[PDB]
């Protein structure tokens, strides 16, 4: 799974992660993807660890959106439009080829999962 900007491959952080295929400048757009949005309670349990949420709504990012791993020291950030219809991943610093691209899931994601170890 890849495009001109990134590639998906095994990550040292866990499972699969998104990596830079080319160098990125600070503030450059890494990925823009559409999201499927529905009330929080309509998602079952399958995607509990993947979904993004705002208030009573949750969104499942398509494209590479749901594959980005988390880091306490991320090199990218994510934002979702009103209605959570689209998500954008922007770098917050220069990223070199081969470097994993990470975002911040937010504290509660991890605090609510004490059995899971954060890398």
């Amino acid at each position: 799974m890849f495009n001109d900007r990134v590639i998906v491959k095994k990550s040292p952080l866990g499972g699969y992660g998104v990596f830079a295929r080319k160098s990125f400048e600070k503030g450059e757009l890494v990925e823009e993807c559409l999201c499927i949005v529905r009330h929080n309670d309509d998602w079952g349990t399958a995607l509990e660890d993947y979904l993004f949420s705002r208030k009573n709504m949750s969104a499942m990012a398509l494209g590479f959106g749901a594959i980005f791993n988390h880091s306490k020291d991320p090199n990218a950030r994510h934002e979702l439009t009103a209605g959570l219809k689209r998500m954008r991943i922007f770098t917050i610093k220069p990223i070199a080829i081969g470097e994993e691209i990470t975002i911040s899931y937010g504290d509660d994601y991890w605090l609510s999962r004490p059995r899971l170890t954060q890398n």
Binding site: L51, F52, E79, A82, L84, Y105, Y109
Partner: peptide
């Protein structure tokens, strides 16, 4: 808790 969703 699910992931945060920062506003634009």
């Amino acid at each position: 808790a699910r992931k945060s969703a920062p506003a634009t």
